[PDB]
């Protein structure tokens, strides 16, 4: 029951190694930019609002939940 999890590393890597081939422009993985963006975005929650700092704040934070899940899972 341990074998499946092994080759998916092999299968994933290729896909994303090929993915590293396909788009050579590459950033940090693991949701590195979101928090920055989450900041960078609700930075507009200071900049944007007559209203939508809410929307810009609410937009900014939902980024983080994917790795936060990965953090939390």
């Amino acid at each position: 029951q341990f074998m499946e999890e092994t080759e998916r590393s092999l299968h994933d890597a290729i896909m994303i190694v090929r993915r590293a081939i396909k788009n050579d422009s590459v950033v940090a993985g693991g949701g590195a930019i979101e928090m920055e963006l989450s900041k960078y975005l609700r930075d507009y929650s200071r900049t944007i609002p007559g209203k939508q700092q809410l929307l810009i704040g609410a937009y900014a934070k939902a980024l983080e939940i994917i790795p936060r899940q990965l953090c939390d899972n």
Partner: protein, 132 residues
Amino acid sequence: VLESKSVVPGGGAVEAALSIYLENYATSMGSREQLAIAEFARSLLVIPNTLAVNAAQDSTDLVAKLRAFHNEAQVNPERKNLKWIGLDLSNGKPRDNKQAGVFEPTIVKVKSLKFATEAAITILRIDDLIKL
């Protein structure tokens, strides 16, 4: 005015500053109390809310309009286009000190600050209401 020479300029334009002012210092902490600096700075904007509310206004337009006013941060009747100052009641948007925009004397906050600061905490501490 007589007793307090120091007096807080602005009614609600402080709210957005005081929001972002700490929301600036929020991220500086990191970790959890980065949140302690946020909901704190979140809980401010009800003052623009309730004043918008009780004026039949909507601070979501007003209090958000607030937070857009800044160079970095301050509540001052220097330039309200680029900074915060004041407030209304009938509206609830930043206005100036000689104009409309509201005031406080110096003292009231720290009391109501620490009051609300202590208000939330203590009833929290107890989880057991129960009886003998």
